[PDB]
Amino acid sequence: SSSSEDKGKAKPLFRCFEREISTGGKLVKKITNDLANLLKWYSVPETISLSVWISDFSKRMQQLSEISESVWLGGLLNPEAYITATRQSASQLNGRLHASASFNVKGMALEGAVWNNDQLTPTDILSTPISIATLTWKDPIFNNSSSKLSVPVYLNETRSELLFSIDLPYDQSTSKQNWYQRSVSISSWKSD
Amino acid sequence: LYQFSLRAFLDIFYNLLNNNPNLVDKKDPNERLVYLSKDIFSMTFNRVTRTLLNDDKLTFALQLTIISVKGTSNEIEESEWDFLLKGGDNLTSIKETIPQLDSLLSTTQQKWLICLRQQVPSFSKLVDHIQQNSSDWKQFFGKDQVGEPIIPESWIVAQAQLSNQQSTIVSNFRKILLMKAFHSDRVLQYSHSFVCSVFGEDFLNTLDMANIVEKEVKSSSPLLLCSVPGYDASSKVDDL
Amino acid sequence: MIRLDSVGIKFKSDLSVPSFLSKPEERLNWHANSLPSDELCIENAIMLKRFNRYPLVIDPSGQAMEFLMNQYADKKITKTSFLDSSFMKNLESALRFGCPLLVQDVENIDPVLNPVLNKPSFMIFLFTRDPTAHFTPDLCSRVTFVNFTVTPSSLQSQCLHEALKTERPDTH
Amino acid sequence: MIRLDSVGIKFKSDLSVPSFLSKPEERLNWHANSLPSDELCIENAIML
Amino acid sequence: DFTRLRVLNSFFSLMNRSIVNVIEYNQLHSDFPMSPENQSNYITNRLLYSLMWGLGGSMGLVERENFSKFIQTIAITPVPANTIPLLDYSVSIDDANWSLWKNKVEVETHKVASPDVVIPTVDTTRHVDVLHAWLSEHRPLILCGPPGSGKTMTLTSTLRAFPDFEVVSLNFSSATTPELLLKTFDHHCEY
Amino acid sequence: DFPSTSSLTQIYGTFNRALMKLLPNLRSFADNLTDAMVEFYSESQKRFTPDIQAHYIYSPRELSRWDRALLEAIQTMDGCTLEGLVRLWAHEALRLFQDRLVETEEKEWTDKKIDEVALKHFPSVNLDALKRPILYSNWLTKDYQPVNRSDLREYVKARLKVFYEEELDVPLVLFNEVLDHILRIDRVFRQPQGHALLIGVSGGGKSVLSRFVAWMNGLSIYTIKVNNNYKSSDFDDDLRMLLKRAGCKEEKICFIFDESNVLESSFLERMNTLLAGGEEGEEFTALMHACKETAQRSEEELYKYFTSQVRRNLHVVFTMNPASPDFHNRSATSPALFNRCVLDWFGEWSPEALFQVGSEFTRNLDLENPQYIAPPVFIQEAEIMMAIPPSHRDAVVSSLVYIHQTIGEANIRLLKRQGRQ
Numbered sequence A: 001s002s003s004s005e006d007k008g009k010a011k012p013l014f015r016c017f018e019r020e021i022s023t024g025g026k027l028v029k030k031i032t033n034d035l036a037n038l039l040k041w042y043s044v045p046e047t048i049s050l051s052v053w054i055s056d057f058s059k060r061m062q063q064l065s066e067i068s069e070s071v072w073l074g075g076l077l078n079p080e081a082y083i084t085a086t087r088q089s090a091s092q093l094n095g096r097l098h099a100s101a102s103f104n105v106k107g108m109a110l111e112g113a114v115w116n117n118d119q120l121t122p123t124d125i126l127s128t129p130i131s132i133a134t135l136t137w138k139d140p141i142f143n144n145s146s147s148k149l150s151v152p153v154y155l156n157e158t159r160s161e162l163l164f165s166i167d168l169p170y171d172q173s174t175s176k177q178n179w180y181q182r183s184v185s186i187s188s189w190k191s192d
Numbered sequence B: 001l002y003q004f005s006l007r008a009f010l011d012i013f014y015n016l017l018n019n020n021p022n023l024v025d026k027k028d029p030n031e032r033l034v035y036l037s038k039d040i041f042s043m044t045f046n047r048v049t050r051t052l053l054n055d056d057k058l059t060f061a062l063q064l065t066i067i068s069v070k071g072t073s074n075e076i077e078e079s080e081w082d083f084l085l086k087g088g089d090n091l092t093s094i095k096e097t098i099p100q101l102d103s104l105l106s107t108t109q110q111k112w113l114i115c116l117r118q119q120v121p122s123f124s125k126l127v128d129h130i131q132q133n134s135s136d137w138k139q140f141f142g143k144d145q146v147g148e149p150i151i152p153e154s155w156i157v158a159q160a161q162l163s164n165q166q167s168t169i170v171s172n173f174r175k176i177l178l179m180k181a182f183h184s185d186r187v188l189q190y191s192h193s194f195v196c197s198v199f200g201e202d203f204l205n206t207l208d209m210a211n212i213v214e215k216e217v218k219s220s221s222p223l224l225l226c227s228v229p230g231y232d233a234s235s236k237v238d239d240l
Numbered sequence C: 001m002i003r004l005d006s007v008g009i010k011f012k013s014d015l016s017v018p019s020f021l022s023k024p025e026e027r028l029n030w031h032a033n034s035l036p037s038d039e040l041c042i043e044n045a046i047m048l049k050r051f052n053r054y055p056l057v058i059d060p061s062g063q064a065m066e067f068l069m070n071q072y073a074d075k076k077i078t079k080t081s082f083l084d085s086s087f088m089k090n091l092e093s094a095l096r097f098g099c100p101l102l103v104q105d106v107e108n109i110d111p112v113l114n115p116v117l118n119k120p121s122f123m124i125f126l127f128t129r130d131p132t133a134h135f136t137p138d139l140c141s142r143v144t145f146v147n148f149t150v151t152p153s154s155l156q157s158q159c160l161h162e163a164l165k166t167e168r169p170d171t172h
Numbered sequence D: 001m002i003r004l005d006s007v008g009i010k011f012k013s014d015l016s017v018p019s020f021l022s023k024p025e026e027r028l029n030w031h032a033n034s035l036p037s038d039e040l041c042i043e044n045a046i047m048l
Numbered sequence E: 001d002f003t004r005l006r007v008l009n010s011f012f013s014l015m016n017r018s019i020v021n022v023i024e025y026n027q028l029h030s031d032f033p034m035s036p037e038n039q040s041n042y043i044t045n046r047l048l049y050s051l052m053w054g055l056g057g058s059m060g061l062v063e064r065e066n067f068s069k070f071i072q073t074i075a076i077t078p079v080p081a082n083t084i085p086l087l088d089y090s091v092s093i094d095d096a097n098w099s100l101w102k103n104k105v106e107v108e109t110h111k112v113a114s115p116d117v118v119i120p121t122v123d124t125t126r127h128v129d130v131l132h133a134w135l136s137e138h139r140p141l142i143l144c145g146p147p148g149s150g151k152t153m154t155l156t157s158t159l160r161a162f163p164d165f166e167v168v169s170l171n172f173s174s175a176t177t178p179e180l181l182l183k184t185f186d187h188h189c190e191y
Numbered sequence F: 001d002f003p004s005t006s007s008l009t010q011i012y013g014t015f016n017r018a019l020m021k022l023l024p025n026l027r028s029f030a031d032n033l034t035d036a037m038v039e040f041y042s043e044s045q046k047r048f049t050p051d052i053q054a055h056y057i058y059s060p061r062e063l064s065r066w067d068r069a070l071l072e073a074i075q076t077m078d079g080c081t082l083e084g085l086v087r088l089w090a091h092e093a094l095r096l097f098q099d100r101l102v103e104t105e106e107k108e109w110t111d112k113k114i115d116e117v118a119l120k121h122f123p124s125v126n127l128d129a130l131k132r133p134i135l136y137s138n139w140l141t142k143d144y145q146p147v148n149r150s151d152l153r154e155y156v157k158a159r160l161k162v163f164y165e166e167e168l169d170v171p172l173v174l175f176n177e178v179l180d181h182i183l184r185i186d187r188v189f190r191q192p193q194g195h196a197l198l199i200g201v202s203g204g205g206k207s208v209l210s211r212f213v214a215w216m217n218g219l220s221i222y223t224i225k226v227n228n229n230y231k232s233s234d235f236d237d238d239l240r241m242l243l244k245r246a247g248c249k250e251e252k253i254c255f256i257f258d259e260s261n262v263l264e265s266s267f268l269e270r271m272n273t274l275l276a277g278g279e280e281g282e283e284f285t286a287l288m289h290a291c292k293e294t295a296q297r298s299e300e301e302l303y304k305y306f307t308s309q310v311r312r313n314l315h316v317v318f319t320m321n322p323a324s325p326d327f328h329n330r331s332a333t334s335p336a337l338f339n340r341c342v343l344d345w346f347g348e349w350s351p352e353a354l355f356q357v358g359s360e361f362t363r364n365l366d367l368e369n370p371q372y373i374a375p376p377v378f379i380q381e382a383e384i385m386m387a388i389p390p391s392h393r394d395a396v397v398s399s400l401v402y403i404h405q406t407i408g409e410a411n412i413r414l415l416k417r418q419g420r421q
Ligand SMILES: Nc1ncnc2c1ncn2[C@@H]1O[C@H](COP(=O)(O)OP(=O)(O)O)[C@@H](O)[C@H]1O
Pocket: E113, E115, E117, E118, E119, E120, E121, E124, E146, E147, E148, E149, E150, E151, E152, E153, E154, F003, F011, F059, F060, F061, F064
């Protein structure tokens, strides 16, 4: 009754977005009409309320639009792809990922840590958002890697789909063991 | 996993009347009805708790509680028992804000407060209270502050007077609502506490398997031991 | 009656409003004054007595105006009309001396009576000769209609009673 | 009952189908035989 | 009713106005007058523009829309795509080529729904251009539509954008007569 | 013609974006408001077309009165929450769209769209915002603000006890609709050039209620006393004075003019002119001499001053029965009436109102009977509406209502058979 009536009012890179836009649309239309009738073409957390799926869904299609006229990584429909893409594009120019001919992402979050003084350091928060980051594919630097911490970037909280892995320096004041058990990770998608 | 039978309740009811320890000396009618009125709850919980997984012993305890005060002085308002179950369920659609409180509350926090003032009449004057006496709600809405959140006594009294409800039990319930709204990790702490202010520090406490299987279970009723993966009850049986 | 019955309220099944609001003696005097004997007139006579709002009589055949004229002579009954201006004054006199005033040709009633009809021994009777006449909803609301136009049943009675009254004068 | 009343058929405004079809003694024994003591069951009892 | 002279006058008055914008334009930009190129495209556009408002003004809305389409699907001179009723377009005195009305022309809390405020739209805009041509010629135009449609507003507003007009309202009734209208003069004018 | 929905959304979107500055806490609800006002307005305009009822014409004028009423309310309140903004939006929708409706079936459609639109655009609003009845009044608190049937009744009931000794000693049953009208009429009197058009049954309450509220606003009541010999020359006379006390005396007045009052077509025209703006021979002298006189207490400017008092000091309350053949054609006759006044449809008295009146008029009669058993057909009747197990008194009063209605229908039948009305 009330539930459906509601939802209704809310309804080597170009290669990539082409499929996003494309795919999004098909889903736009698909769900657009499928509802009208009555009267997960992408990955998201097991449990997650309907209102949020919709709320988030709606925000993703907009993400989509802003892309047409022309990057919320964990908001795209195929994050894996966008990356495997940038691999070649970022490669089609200059050419192992690395953070800081390279792209920039926003919408990610630090889980179990915070970034103070160009490094990972302890916190009382379960997770804090990252406004943006620069990644670059290398071949060069990954040599001083025994003094840095490997932080995995998962599609989302569940920690069940790894997009890629990124190396970062950490507040050496704490043990490398204290860190390994802290289990810091990065979610590319965080709800609010 | 929670299939309970009428026969099972009737069995509890029988003992509430006859085999009630708490009631084996007095014979006065208007005296005995006192124990009878309250013991139905605790006695039912004693028998049901044996089937419930730990995270559900309080959940069912809250239901039993809400029912026991029904029709008494300290009976929980519907709007109040409602907010607990649905409160803020729509948060992701709240566009109203509370400017007057940016120096004190986050965005989501404000949103939540709008729900409270909006859904529950007892909290009609919460935003104005938070406004007038900021330094009490101070540490409450505050980040990394050692010390458990503290709902200001000033509020636990101001509101205890606005509504014609000066009851502890009801007061303890209004505390769950604030916690659901601003500290979800405290919901259990405070629920437990509320339940305990109706029955007793003890009602929610952990069972001789001797008696049960002996003089407390009719032979027509089997004994199941539904367990969690990897856990084997098999032993327990062979023992007895 | 069906409503009163389906709800549990008690009333008389052989009830007759007239014989419940008038004595068989007065009803008799009514007939002596040219009240046609037909339950329709007898019923109308009752409204002409216990009327709350004033009465506006629909009497095309004139059978009523005769009645009321006799029935009320006693109290100096006046017969005026909204025609000649001689009217207005009669109204003033009849509201001062409390006498019954019958006014013909309601067809054009000055609105300068609404406060009268809307409100001591005074009373007014509005009349019509038009059986096929139309009055506004306003008038309808401030009036107590009493319809004297005869139906085939009404006449059958008037005659039968008249017949007997002559044929079997003894039993009458 | 509304129907009967509307048609002019006379009946007991407050008729207990259970009393109309079983003696008070017949019931005491029903309960003594474990019939739950509620209006629904007493009604069921007459059906049985 | 449709009468031949009623629409031709409405139309002549516009065409004329058109040409007056040239006289007027130069009169300012005397510096470097209008190019033959322009005084033709512009005028020839102002002709087609003038036909739809001079004859379509007295038509329904969708009517005038169909009617304008027609003009477009027959005209010679350059006309915007058959994907926007020439109605939605105007004619710029500079470029001299068609323009989109949408490209044409805030409030204070307390004057919000205040009677005298007029949030400008495509309608009010193209309306002042048309009424301007008729008011300049001092013709007796008639704004016709249902009550609330914007008539009283459209007028008092166009006249506001011309400080040389002193307007005086009057509300005719079933019994208005030469005299009433007359008396209303002897109280603003001088014989 | 009428601006389009897009054209409109843009016009009022601007108005609202600017009005919502008085409410920083609701800044994101502005375009929200515009979409709801523009949507409900369009829906009503298409559901209520002239072929159904003459006066069922609508225009952006509604959207404007709507926005101006919003602006006024908001200016007299220390803040407002979404629910506040939504209830205010519903209330004004009801005054500007529902009051005029004739059939209940038409008012329900309205009550339904209001709710429907409100949820489509104000999804986070709590339904408590739309709890019926949606009432408002400036009589029980400092400024405008919601009110409920009870508190309002205890009030009007008190203000009525004093109205009786003084003014009119006619007992008024405050049934639901009555409360609804002595509030709508109020709004009208609380405004400049405020004129009302009450159309309904005769003896339904239009005049007495118009009085009680003329009285509440300290307005003086006036009415021409027409008679079987009252000429179209008799009128301007009273007119000279009515306006006289309004402009010169600065005396607030409620002129309750009835449809029977127009004994001549010329009669409408006079009012039809004074209906809008505010307003010869030797007369024209004192009609300025007094001006001057009070003007005290340039010639032309002097007469504007008079015609400017009348306007914001005199109130016209027209009353009509939509059954007298001097009705429908009345609009085509005096187009300022159903076009300049606030039309409030009284209509008939509901079965619920009839229950009340019959109830209170028999409050002192002994209609008790402890030996009375409510029959099944009647216990059911109370169910749809009266004590848990209907009482003897209930049986009586409700049967007074039932009987009243049988006469309505017997009338329809009489008409469809003997053609008598
Ligand atoms: N573009 C607009 N800007 C502001 N208000 C408008 C606009 N269009 C319509 N309106 C509103 O619609 C109403 C139209 O009334 P008006 O034009 O004065 O009467 P009529 O159309 O009967 O002559 C006005 O009250 C005004 O508030």
